[PDB]
Design a binder for these strands. Sequence first.
DNA 1: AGGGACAAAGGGCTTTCCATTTATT
Lengths: 246, 302, 302, 173
Amino acid sequence: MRKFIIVKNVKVDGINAKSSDITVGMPPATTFCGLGETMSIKTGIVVKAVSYGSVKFEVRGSRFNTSVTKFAWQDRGNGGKANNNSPIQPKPLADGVFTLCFEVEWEDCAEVLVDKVTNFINTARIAGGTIASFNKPFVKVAKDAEELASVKNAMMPCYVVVDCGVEVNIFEDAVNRKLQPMVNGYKKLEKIVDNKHMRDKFTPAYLATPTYTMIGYKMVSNVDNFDQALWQYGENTKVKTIGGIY
Amino acid sequence: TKLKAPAVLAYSRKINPTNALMFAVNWSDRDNTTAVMVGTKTVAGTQSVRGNPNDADKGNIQTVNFANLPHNKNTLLVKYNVKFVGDVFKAELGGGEYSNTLQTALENTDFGTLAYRYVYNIAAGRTLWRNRVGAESIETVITVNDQTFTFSDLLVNEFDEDVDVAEIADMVAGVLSGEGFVTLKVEHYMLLGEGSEVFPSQEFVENSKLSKQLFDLNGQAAMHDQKIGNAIRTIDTWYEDATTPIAVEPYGSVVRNGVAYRAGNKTDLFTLMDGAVNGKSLTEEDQMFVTANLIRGGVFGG
Amino acid sequence: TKLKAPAVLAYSRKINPTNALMFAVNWSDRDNTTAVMVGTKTVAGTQSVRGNPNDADKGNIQTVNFANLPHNKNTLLVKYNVKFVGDVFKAELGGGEYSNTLQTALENTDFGTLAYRYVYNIAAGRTLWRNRVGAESIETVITVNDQTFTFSDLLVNEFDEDVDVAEIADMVAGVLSGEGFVTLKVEHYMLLGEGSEVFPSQEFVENSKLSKQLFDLNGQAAMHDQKIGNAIRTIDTWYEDATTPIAVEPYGSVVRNGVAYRAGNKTDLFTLMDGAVNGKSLTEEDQMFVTANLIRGGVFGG
Amino acid sequence: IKEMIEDFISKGGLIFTHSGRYTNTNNSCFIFNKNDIGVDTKVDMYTPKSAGIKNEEGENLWQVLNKANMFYRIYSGELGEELQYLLKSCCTAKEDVTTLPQIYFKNGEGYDILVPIGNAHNLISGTEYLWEHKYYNTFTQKLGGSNPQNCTHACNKMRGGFKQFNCTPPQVE
DNA sequence: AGGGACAAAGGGCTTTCCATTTATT
């Protein structure tokens, strides 16, 4: 029996929006499925799926030009040049209010699960941001598709992300079908042989490149089956929808 | 010993502020929290730039943004949160032994002074910078762990002792020494006048329409969070020929003025952090400076 | 010797006026304030250009804005507030080596002569610029820190000597010679006549359906705040062949006449500022010219 | 074009289709892929200080090598082995990990630390396609700073900046 | 037993190369 926990109106401030070199905007789904794995390591709750909405989102800067963050001198041997500003490398920022929904199995009491979620939300960061204000989570139980509608409509103000699939490539599909991409996995290229600069020293390392797909932002109360609004790992270094391609 | 630094060290940010908001209220009734929206005006002036005296008879048309208080209210309200997170000695990258021999050599510092100055920068209203200048009477309200405090007037420049700040400082220093977090919600009330000008943060943008752009969330004026985090880290009074407190930087650099104070005389971070590892005993102030840099965080390349 | 100015220098405003408001009251009843709202009318006159004499028979149609006093009231009321901020020598952008050695050369200037004229431009009624023409009697009321002063008739082109302007100038010069701020509240009453025309500030618009758009705050006729501040600093009578006062500006240029009075004859700000740093002795009358430019603000960088 | 090929190989002279100089300038990590080169795949090239040589028209090696699919024409070997061997000796691997993001990923019963790097074909194809096909929801961003002569020849030749997709979602009123 | 030589690793300063094609709402 599956259980759901829903956090509403999570204010995140200072999200670095550069998901890839050609996409600047919402953070992709891989961030939100990495967040569930982070919760599984830190707390102990096993999470197999994650859905997410977007109440508000705004990339700071003007319309066609994003703003640049200032840089400070943070390197050994930069004493001579320290009085002058800095070299500047690109990274944009964005501000938004999100809604999160997990899919856990707990098989225990429901009055300690909310406390275990709340002990984690005060610590973690949503894509390098700062969590300012969030509502208290609540536990939802669904059995079949008729009882699943409850957990779907629970989070009413929302804009969930559903899969759409690629026809030939992202450029022609974006021009013709009017869709905007999202990275949903990475393809590895060459193994790093010297692991004295990694942060694990034991895990094998690979150089990788992003691989894209196309998405659609949809009203959550206008989705037939809720399983097309979920995301999970599984495939070769890739994430995918539970309910297939919408 | 004779051990050298790794290529990259990385420490997270232990002091997390949020972006503040701006409201217009009254000194009597502080409940009508009306938002302060950002407008757009066009202004006709003269050029008057250095040199180019040939073009000193023409005018230049400039489009800017502005944010003023309405003529019915005379009080500015600033709201934000500040979170202090402990465990300041755990490394993110390049840990090894370099971090352990520094942790065991910096476990006898003075966290009380650092916590007191970190709270007193919030308490004195140093996070305002143009909003503080011109205001008649400021009033700060701090809500930490269902114990509400209120301050009246402090001196920004000098760290004067008082019994109100010491309780919150002792609460913060217990978090920064052990493990855990503490969040405090800060509100600032400023008495300016009917129809005065408030000052949000200005963008580093290349827009072709506006000469000046202000930061806003859904139209309402606001300040950047990384802008606000600079005032908390203004505790550095231990550099050579110290006159005014500066921000905590590894080289002690103020690029706005164009000078670097701490760098160039074997007093910066990358000399003291090697001397502390290699057995040399430090003074009470440059033991605090390194720890203040760790609380600030950052990466450190080779 | 011969130190160059830094590439980034910036000076903030030291005089902060607010955007004025217009009301309609009677002359013998100073409390029945009503708003002067802005309306729109359509006019059907003829057209005439210094070209196209062939089209001197087609009446063009224009859509303009207007604002007038009602027919039961005959006195226009203008309300605003002026703030004077001290510490006029501290640079925002740019550090020392230049501003610090300019402060020690501009230390002994005559702040009384500047602070007399800055208040005399408010007391005489130069801050109106079109409502002054065609007025039987003007009356200005200035309120500062629970003290009220009333001025009836003052010459505008001549800086006369009296006993009540000097009571405010000694307060303003104390702020401008030190630190702090002071607030003046100014109300102007002019007796124009019933049904007369009032003159707000126009607005810069791009290809609007209106041929003339006036400034408005919630539908009430107002004046621009940077238009108010231009009348205050019209104190400059020290250029070559001086006849009438002009605004304080680094080239002394007015865009209406199309001429720069101070530029082109080694008399402008940037030539005078560089000479005073290097050790040359300034004249007793242009020391107040350079000091008035730091109160105005701007960009002085290479 | 042998007189320009030997001049480029007398310099540093690397040819890649996947690098990390598009993320951080201080990277110097270059990857050439064998399974991705096709009939329209455009590659990039790096030398110190972006030093080049003209061909009495105003074109360097990068402007020649991308026009009319010349890189595949030397690469497939239809211009002989005189230039194909020199082209194959040009594109080598250069592996660096500093100043790059390192994230974990969940593989089958274990984790995998991996480093995302940039794609050279995607940037150039994206800018040169969206402009001609009139797509006006983009971010124009130039990289390299005041001296773009430090990252790539493609940085230097087109200073107008690459185009990035806007991915701002709609919001609840 | 200890200054002096033998040669390295950081570090300031000084070059150095180097060029597009702007609409969008």
